[PDB]
Every structure is written in structure tokens, then in C-alpha cells.
Assembly symmetry: D4
Amino acid sequence: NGFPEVIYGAGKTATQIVGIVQALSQQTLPILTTRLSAEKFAALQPALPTAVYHATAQCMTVGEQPAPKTPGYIAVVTAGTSDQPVAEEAAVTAETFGNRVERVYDVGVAGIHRLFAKLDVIRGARVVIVIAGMEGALASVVGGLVDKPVIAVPTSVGYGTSFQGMTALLTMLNSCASGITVVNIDNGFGAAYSASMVNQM
Amino acid sequence: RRNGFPEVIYGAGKTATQIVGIVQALSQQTLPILTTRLSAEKFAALQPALPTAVYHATAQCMTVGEQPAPKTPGYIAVVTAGTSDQPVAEEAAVTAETFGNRVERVYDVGVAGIHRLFAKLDVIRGARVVIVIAGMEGALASVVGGLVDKPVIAVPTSVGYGTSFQGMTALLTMLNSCASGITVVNIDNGFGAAYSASMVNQM
Amino acid sequence: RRNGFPEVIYGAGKTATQIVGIVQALSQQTLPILTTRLSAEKFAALQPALPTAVYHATAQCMTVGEQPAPKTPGYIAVVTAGTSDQPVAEEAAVTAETFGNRVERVYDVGVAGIHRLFAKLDVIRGARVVIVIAGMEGALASVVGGLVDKPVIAVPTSVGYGTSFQGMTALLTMLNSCASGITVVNIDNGFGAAYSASMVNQM
Amino acid sequence: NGFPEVIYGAGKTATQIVGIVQALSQQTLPILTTRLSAEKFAALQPALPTAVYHATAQCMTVGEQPAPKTPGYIAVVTAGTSDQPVAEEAAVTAETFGNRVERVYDVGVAGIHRLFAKLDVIRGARVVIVIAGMEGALASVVGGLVDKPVIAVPTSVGYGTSFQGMTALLTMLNSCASGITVVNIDNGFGAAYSASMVNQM
Amino acid sequence: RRNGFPEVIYGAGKTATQIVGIVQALSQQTLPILTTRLSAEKFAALQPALPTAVYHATAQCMTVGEQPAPKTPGYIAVVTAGTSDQPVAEEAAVTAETFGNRVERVYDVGVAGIHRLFAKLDVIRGARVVIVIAGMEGALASVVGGLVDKPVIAVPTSVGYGTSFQGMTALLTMLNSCASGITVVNIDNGFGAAYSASMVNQM
Amino acid sequence: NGFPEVIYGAGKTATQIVGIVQALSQQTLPILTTRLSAEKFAALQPALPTAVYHATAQCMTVGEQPAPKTPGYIAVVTAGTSDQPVAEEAAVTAETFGNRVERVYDVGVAGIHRLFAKLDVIRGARVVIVIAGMEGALASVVGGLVDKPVIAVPTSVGYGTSFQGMTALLTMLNSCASGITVVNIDNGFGAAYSASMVNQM
Amino acid sequence: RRNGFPEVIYGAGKTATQIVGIVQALSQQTLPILTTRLSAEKFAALQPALPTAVYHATAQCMTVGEQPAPKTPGYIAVVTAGTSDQPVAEEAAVTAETFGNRVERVYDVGVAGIHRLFAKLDVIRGARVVIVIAGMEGALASVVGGLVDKPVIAVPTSVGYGTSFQGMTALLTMLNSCASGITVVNIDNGFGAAYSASMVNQM
Amino acid sequence: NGFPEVIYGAGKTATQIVGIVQALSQQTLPILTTRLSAEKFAALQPALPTAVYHATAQCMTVGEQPAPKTPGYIAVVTAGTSDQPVAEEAAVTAETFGNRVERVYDVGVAGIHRLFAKLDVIRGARVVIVIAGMEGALASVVGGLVDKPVIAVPTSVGYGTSFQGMTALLTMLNSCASGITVVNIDNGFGAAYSASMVNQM
Ligand SMILES: [Mg+2]
Ligand SMILES: [Mg+2]
Ligand SMILES: [Mg+2]
Ligand SMILES: [Mg+2]
């Protein structure tokens, strides 16, 4: 089929992932765990010593770390430092599928000059992924400045009236006619999954 | 006591003769009066009743009276995202001028083509205050906010396609951009924005 | 710089003569232009002004210009749930073809009668991308998503009975289906979906 | 009357259920406890040793476990493993009322072939109960494929934009013209109650 | 394979001739067909096209075909809160009868005057199923639910004053009443309620 | 003026109420504390030994318990046992203001016969106060059966789709033409305050 | 049994002849009847049918019958925020008078110019009950509530600009003001407010 | 530039603020920390002993406390004592930027006479800042009584139907034609930032 396996680390218990990981990882393409608790990564180190963990990403993969299967790369960009978790969740997921990924972090619209410094890197990426929370303006900015496919991920980070990310989700929908397609809140996985399919062309 | 304010009438709540009954009752102070949000038909039956009255179709407002020079040399900037927001922006611009301010309009400056914003950034930054008006693309307030170090009044507009929610999303996004002096007002309320912007300009 | 894109005009924001003032001003590049979401009356007063223009009533769009061969041999699939979503789907299909793509339409493929989906599954799966369009029954994006291993752009539609919320529920359900490459766009935004789908098809 | 008794395990205190269970279970049809805390099942074992507990269902019944009062059975189907709690809450409630119930678990639309494998069992059930959370598509699928009464239960399980189950509740309402009638979020009890009445015909 | 169901057409999505093109194409099975939610003008241009067709203005539905005896001796009860819910209730009643059920209507049984409910409680309780229909006063489903030990399908209606939210509150209240067999359907969906109620009546 | 004093027990700290209670209760009409924590009632017993506490009401009054200043009484009615807290919050507040109050508890619409048993008491009360949460039908029922002023209080108690009491608030508004006026969620104080004014006529 | 209440008909739910069929059927008790929320056209076709009927255009209500003296000497106060709330307030005032109460109207008492409230505060405070009616500026209920020690029934109105949400925000703000006897009713429900206010006035 | 630096105390970790404070406070205008945890103010005292902390404001500034750079002052007014936190958050932020600020606290509409006692002070302030939560009526009152620029801040404080401050945000928007411009919930920083710009004219 070509796609690795993926589970639901937050939806399952501390060991149901490992009870089915051995029934699902019978020497096949590497495994992926999304939404894994920072504490539950320690309660499973003795069960799988050959496991790597990404604290910022809250994801863990046990197996092969593939190589670039395409000369083009995906660009993950984020406005503030508060969205770095869901950014790395998308980054390591786009890495498991076998796509080189370039990280462009802390590039909010409050400092728009920071984007034009890294615009040459963003424009030369087969797909780009915009991440935002409070006032998801970054999507509209990169959408009108980059004529390449963009995936938008809203984040639940923020305080009052952000509505746990709902008001960023509505922003990036309202600027979709610029080449932007948006997925669900905190769904860095679904963005990198779709971005991988577009990059694997 | 009056502190130098022109008179304002809500043109949508009154009938075609109730507003001319309040204009001719105020036609003695020599200070210009203003009427907001009145339809083109609400004025068409008035042109014979008020020969000394001028109407702005795009702004949907009417002002009648001798309008003297601006009270302050500073100018406020009315920034618009797309062509579909020209009504509300002109509603704010024509009412901002009536209170006695100079106003430099900066229209069609959406994020779709940000270079248009950097073209007129010098005019926007050198203004006492800036009023941002945007609809489906509520991002414009965030961009201008972080690029100007002067007060900003954001005004969402109801024009948009689906999920624009008659400008409700534009309201939330402008609210979540209160970083570098962003301040939002009600939906479509170009007047109240220019009301607050006139006091800041004439501090 | 232009990278090979046809021209697009928002037909709902302009008047009947403002769009023919922009068509004849662009009638020199020989590259076809497009106009989205213009009413049948907004075109009826134009047929004498543009003899070389064709209109799609179901799509509510107008394209004028010599349309050459497709730029890529791949084809995108426009999948529709019910007969009531034919407008938006055709809006996406006719604009997806203008950018220079082949498109194989797959209509009336609702979950009410899933066998109709398994009938044309071979055509849908062998396409470079797939655009799903659904209204009250937002489930179609979820089913096609888990059944095709190609990118999918979901487009909710406003048509529906009560609680459909002008397609708002269809938006939420398509958003909660981002498993196997599902990606949603704005309500009724068949154009923006096909805009993104054209770049993925011509990577 | 024919119906057993039922209480509100989460709405009452640790012993108000037992203070009224003896005033209400004076040797009558078996008793039922909905929404009972996993901890409070241990603080009441000494008070009623003849009590059975279902951890997955979070329900406990003290008395007779009846037999099938009708040759037909009710089918409880669920899309993912995250809805198994409210599924078993409905399953054991349909069992107390005296209806045989067939469980068809982990049958999401992401793997639609899993449903057609068990479709012969679902189609031959006097009533079926669909359970879903994220993108409640399963209801519409079974509704258009099974010409038998369907009850729909939305679940609060899920992350962003699921709105604690609200966005599944709206989905199954919008496909009611296919023989689907939907109840409240996490209300596995009300679904099995109605499904029992339909089965007891 | 068909299991004994009459044919149904969504009269709101089609044009005045598209539904008569589907009626005459089905005028060979001798099994009656049904059309829901078609306007009185959508039928007025049809009376010459279908002499063997009967229309129910209050129900906004049309049925054409030889309608035989009921399939089961049991009867379902259609309970209505106020006079303003007669349209949707009759939409459910006329479609519930077409599938081959007897139906005993119980109208104007609002909580404002609960004695009217206790008057016809004997008729309601002795029915195989009961369909409750209510608008601003969504409480009726809760009262009947706790008073009958038979399945109940609740149907909210969009009619109401402010805060009724086109029947959205009626939907929530009927949802929070799932105690004694209450089960809610979509807004105004009298058909789908009667569709489910026909299968329960003919178990 | 005639009205006792009232504070905000949940909005203030453990002793700001007592720091201002002595500046506000300089030998005047009795004092009232709304929304007081069950734990904070113990951290203040040494500061005011002449204080009475109502655990169910989560309110405490320090001073005179007045007598009926009017021969008529207010009736507080509640559908289920889960609304008894906010019911007693209204009951003891209507008692401080000097109105006799009759309690009619556990009278849901699921057992409508329980209401007609106590309808003779409800109908003879100058004001009545309906309390409800899940499916606030009780208000509409008593409103159409009692031609006397009714105050409606929605409660935050309930599970899914109750929206922390929001969906009961909308119900009792939609049946206001029957002599019903509704206040805020869990605002038993504001109901008894208004009911007192109507009774003190 | 009737306890002294006039008759009330929902004028919006019935047709132009159904309400005159209920008026002439009640034209024998000599007790006046009332009809709420009927349009000016719904009465224009009635003036010949009921010569002994009077209509209130601002209130959109019609009352027919010999109206005797007030039942109690106390008076209720109907307080209005702006000129745009005169319809609903008059709907409450004319129905409050029909039940047999004196009512002292206090109009145009918005927070924009609070001195107008302190001018007529003596009249408002000395009333048995007070009904507050406000739209976009829902603050008026909070101000009057803390300034009068008599029961208050708040009534939000649907009139407003953006974000007023057809008076939904006015409903929330009046709900969050339940401090000194504030009690809110449904949107635009001036009748139900006056229904409750008549029982409190005649305790 | 003229503006001091500001961080996000709640969005960062216990020391990321200090890891970048020394890279950002290389002997420049004073530093500002918004939304700082009451506990995290103690875990950083050994790292910066020359730091002052405002418990009510939940903000801490390390450096110069400037002097009035303009003879006019900003007025922060609040209705109840429950909004004093976000009030002091705005007060100390307007103080860092170099504006004298006058505090007018506990001035709700329930006691409107308290406002007219301090109205002479409010009217003589180049900018005023209204703070409110439950029934944000105070903004409309001061807006119609003060012909000077007003900034409105809604607070998340309150109970039922306040919707974590959402229903105050909608109130002050609906009275913007009186010279009122409103910012986000609990955003005392953004209000004082804008109020400073207006005062620095
Ligand atoms: Mg682009
Ligand atoms: Mg079916
Ligand atoms: Mg009554
Ligand atoms: Mg002012």
C-alpha cells in the first residue's frame, strides 16, 4: 500500500497501543503514535527500548526513519512559539511518510519582515503548511504570497474569545480562494498526511 | 454643553419626513448636521425639501450645512480590504470628515496582494490614527496593526460568502489581534469607529 | 509574474458593466478569463456585449476566450451527493477545467444508496485528486476519504432542510473526517477547492 | 408494568442509591444503575455483595439477568473503539429489559469493508443502534443500507471541533429521512430503552 | 429489492415538470407514490397533467395512485401542540398513511391547558407508536413521553417567536427528554419521523 | 430600606467577606452569603460562632431569622433531586427576606401525577418558583396550570447537550406568554429576590 | 374557571376571517377581548366587519369591547430605551391596560443621555411594577434595576444593527442583571411581560 | 522606537522568559511580563532579584519605573471587585509605558451614585478604560456620560450564561456609537497599550 501505520495514543490506554502494535508491526513499514502523553512515553520504554520520542511533538515512532523519496520538500511554518507542539506533530508525521521537511518557526504577522526573510525557502517547497491560533492571519498572508498548495491547521492555544481554536478555524476558511485548504483544530497529522500525498506526486 | 460636535441622525430608524423635521429644526446653529445609514429612496423624496444638502450614495449618508476647515492638521487613514467594503468605509470616511478631520483614503489593500499595502504604507504610517475595514479577510487588521505604531480602530463588514457569518468571524479575528493598538468596534459600525477616531485625532 | 493562470472575476461583487469593462480590458493576452458566481440576469444583458462568451447556468459562471488543450494528462474527479448540489459542483468543475485540467464528473453518489458509489469507485480512485461536494449528508466525504488514497478537497453546500445550518454542519463533519487526506474548504466555495485541486494536479 | 427500575448513579451520592434501592427493590424486577463511577462501584460492594459491575459500561445491575422474551435481537454497532463505553451502557441496558443483543464493534467508515462483513448480521436485527463520534458518518451509511429501525447515539469522545459530541449530533439529524431517529449525546440508556420498546412488539 | 415501500420524491428540489416526468415513469407498478414539500403553485400547474392525483395543502404533499387497505391493524398517533404546527403534523400524517398505516390525529394538545391532553390520553396510550410535534413549547414531548409506554418520535417545528431559533430550542428540549422512549428527528422532518414510525408499527 | 445585606461568597476570598461583614453588619438586619464553599464554611466558624450554615443551599446567614411579614407564602418547586442545591439557595434567601416558603420537591414531568397531588398547595401561593434542568418542561406545565406569578430558574445540572443549563434557559423563555418570567442559570438568589418583592405587596 | 381575564388571540397565526370568527363568537360576555401581533393589512379588511373595534398601529394590536375602569389604583411603568422600541413597548402597554391596569409610559430613556432617566425617576420609582424594554443598549434594565426597589420585567427587542443578533445579546445582558428584582422574558414578548406584570400589580 | 518589551508569561515555561529576557533586556527600556503565574513568580526570584511583582495584576516588571511623560492621565474604572485582576493588569501596563493612571474601583451600575461621586475625575482623563463582566452595562453608562475616548475590556468573571465573558463582549460592542471601542476578553494589556498610544499624543 505504501503508507505506514498510525494509532491514537490519547484515545487508547497505556498498553493497548503495545498490545496491538505487535499484531500490527509484524516487521513492516515503521509505526507512528499520535497524541501520546508525556508520562505514558516513560511507562512504555521498557516494553519497546528501540523507540524514539519527540517531547515537543508528543509523538513516538518505532522503526525505520525513511529517506527523501522525492527531491522536493514540505515547509511547516508557524506564527508563534505556542503552536510549536502541533507543528512538530505535523513535522514528524511528514517525516515518517518519507518527505524532507523544512521548519520555519516563529513567523507571526506582528513581525511580517521575518516572513520575507524566509519567503525564498517557503516559495520553493512543493507544499507548505501554515499553523496559527490567535488571529489566524498567517494563512491569508502566505496564501496570497505563495502560489503553491497550502494546508491550514488551527490551534487551540490562546486565551479569551479564541474559543479553543474555533476562531482561527473560521479565519482560514474565509480565505480559501487563495489556494488554501484547511483541516481540523490541532490536526497536524491530517495536514501532513494530505501534504504527503501532494508531495508524493 | 456642546463641545463642538456636529449633529447626527440615525437615518434608518426614522421616516422620510421625520428627518427633514429635525434638519429644519436644527437649521439655525450654522453647524453642519449628519445623517447615517439612510437609503437612496429615503433621500430621493428629500432633494426638493433640502436644496442645500449633499448625499453620498456609496456612504449612504447625507450631510447638510456649511462645512468649515478641518479642526486639526493631522489626518486619519481609512484602509479597506476589498472593493466590497467601499460602502462601510465611505460611511466612516464621510462622517470622519464632517467632525472636522482630514482623511486620506487607502482602498483595495487586501492581503491577496500584500505589495499593495507596502506601496501605501508610508501614507498609512504617518497618520494620527488608522481605521481598518475588512470583511471575509479579517487578517488585514492584524497586518496593519503590527506595521503601524499609531492607534487603530478595526471595523468588520457583513459582506462575505459562507461562514463569514455576516462579518462575525471578521469581528473575532480583529478581536484576537489586539497586539499593537488594535481596537475593534461593532459590525458595519463605520460611524462609531470614526466617532472614536475623531477624538483621538483632536486630543 | 504570471505563472500560467487564467483570470478570475468575482461576478457577484461587480455590476453588469463593470465586468465587461474588465473583460475587454483583458481581451489581449489570448489567455482565457473566468467569472464566478454571476446571476443569469447579470449575463443576459451581456450576450450582445460579448459574442465570444459562453455561460454555464448550472455553474453560474461565464468563461470567454480561446481555451486550449489540458496542461496535464491527469484528471480530477468531482463527486456529488445529491441532485441539489449540482450548482456548486458545476461551479467547481467548470473552473477546474478552465485552468487546464481534465475532469470526470461523478454525480448523484449519495450515501442513500452506497452501491452507486461502488459502481464508479474505479473512476474515482484512478484520479489524481478528488473533490467531494455534499450538503445535508456530509458523510460522503468520510466514505470517499477512507476509500481513495489520493488527496481530497471537501466542499460543503448550503442547500438543506432544518439544522443543516446553511451547510455549517456539513462543514463540521467534513472537518472531523481528516483521516485519509480529507481537506475542507469554505462553504459553497467550489472555486477555491478547484483552485487548490489544479495545483495538486499540475505538481 | 413490565419495566425494571433505573437510577442516576452520577447524579446521586455514594449511598443515596442504596438508601433508596432497598425502598425500591423490595423483591421486584431487577435494578439498574446508569452512569456509576468506577470508584463508587468499590465503595458499595460491602453493601450489596450480590451486585455485578460492568467496567466498560459503567453500569451495575443487582438482581435477575433475564432471558430473551422475543426471538429477535437488537444490534449495537460502533465505529471506533473510543465509543465502546457508551455502547456497553446501551448493551447492558437492552439486556436488562430482556432482549438478546448482538455486538458489532470497531466498524468505522474508514474501513467500510468491515461493515459489509457483518452486514448480514445487522440486517437481521429487529432494531439496530449506531454509535459514533468524530464525523458521525456511520449512521447515514447503515441507515441507507438497512431497512430496519435505527437509533443514533452521538458520543462526546474526540478532540478539536467535535464540540464534546455536538457535531455528531447534528450529522445524524441531517440524515433522518433514511429511517434514522437520534437521541442525546452519550445517552446509550435512552437508545436501548426505545430500542427495547420497538423490539418488545 | 423492494420490500413493499411506496415511492417518495422531494418536491422542493425538482421543477414543475421534473416530478411529472418521474410520476408518469412510475405509473406502471400500481403502487402509490408520494411527493413531499411541494408548494401549492408547484401543484397548480400539474392538475391537468395528473387527473388521478390528490393534493393536501395543509400537508404540502401530493399522492397519486390506488391506495389499498392498511397493512397492519395498529394505529399511530400524531400529537400536535398548537394550531401553528398543523402543516408539519399533516405532512407526517399523510405520509404515514401512504405507507399503509392507520393514524388517529390528536391536535391542539398544548401544555397551555393540559386537561386537553388528559382528555385524549386514552386514544394516545393505546396506539402502537406516537409522534409528538411541537414548536415554541417543546415541553409536550416530555409530558407525553412520561405518560405513554410506547415508542415516541419527536418532531420540532420552525414556527415560533423570538429565541425559538426556527425550532432549534424545540430540538434541544426534545433531545433532553429521552427518558421513556423519546426519540427526536430533524427540524420540520415530519416525513422521516413517519418513515421510522411505519417500520415500528409494522414490525 | 427594608432589605438585608448580601455578598458574593464565591467571588471573594476566605476572609474578605468577614473583613467587610463587620463594617456592613454593624447591628442591622441579618446578613446573607450566597455561593459559599462547603470548605470555607469551616474556615470561618471560629470567626463567627453565631453563624448557621445550609450545606444543601451552600449559603450561610448570621443574624436574625425573621417571621412571616405576610400571611401568604412562596412555593419553591423542583423537578428532580439534582436541582435541590439551587432550590435551597432560593428557599433560604426567600426566608431571610421574611416570607414563609413551602417546598415541593422531586416533581418532574416524568411523574406528572406527583404535581397534581401537590397542586392544591402550589395554586394557593402568592408566588411560585419553578426549578428545572434537563428538558425544562416543568415551567410550562405549572405556568399553564397556575394563574399566579411564576419565576423560572434554569440549572446547570445535566449531561450532554444540556450545555451547562443553557437549553433549559431557552425552554422557559419560549413559554413566557403563560405568566412565566425567567432569570439566569443557577440564580436562585435573583428568583427569590424578585419573588420576595412580589410577595411583599 | 375564569378569574377575570380578558380574551387574547395570537393575530399572527390566524387568517383575516378566522379571528373575526372568534371575536363574534365571543361577542356575548361583555368582557373585552384582545388580539396581539396582527399586521395593519390583517385589520384593514376587518374595519367593516367590526365597527366597535379599535386598532393600535404602533402596538400592532386590536381590542374590541367595552373597557371598564382599572381594577387596581396602582400603575405600572413601561420604560423604553430608544425610539426604535416603541412598537414592542406599546404592544406591552396596550395589553397591560386591557387587563385593567393604569400604565404611565416613560419613553426615550436610553443610557445615551442618562439625565433623561433621572428626570422621570420619581414616576418610575413610585410604580407598583416597572417593565423595561431595550434593544442594542441592553444596559437600561441594569440601571433601572439597581435604582428601583419594585419588581421589574425586562423585555429585549429584535431591532438593532450588527451583533445585536435580533436582540439575543439584549437577552443575555438583561439575564446577567438579575440583582435588584430584574426578570427577563422572551424576545419581543411585550405581551407575556405585561401578563406577568398584571398579576403582580393586582396581587 | 519608544516602546518597552513584553512577553507572554502564561504561554512560555518557567524559564524561557528568563532565557530570552537577557537576550532582549541588554540594558534597554524596562521589561514587562503579562499573565504570569502566582507560583512562577517565586521560582524566578533567585534568577532576577531586582524584580517587582504585582499579585493582583499577575504581572512583573524588571527595570525602570518611568515618570509621567504627559500631564494628562488615564483612568481605569471597574464595576465590581471581581475585575480588579485584569484592571491592575491594565494599570501596571499603562504605568510601564509612562502614563499616570488614576484608579476608580468598585463602581458598578447597581450603585450608580458611586460613579457620579468620581465622575469629575473620570471626565478629566485623556483616556478612560471601562472594565466589566456580568451585564457589561458600565461601558454604555460611562460612554454616554464622558466625551473622551473609552476602551472597553470584558472579563471572564461570572457564573451561568456569562459564557466566560462572551456576553459582556457583545454588550460593549452594541454600544460603540457612543465613543466606545472594545478589545478582547481579559485583554487589559491591549487596552492599556492602545490607551497609551492615545495618551502619548
Ligand atoms: Mg495561492
Ligand atoms: Mg432505512
Ligand atoms: Mg399563568
Ligand atoms: Mg462619548
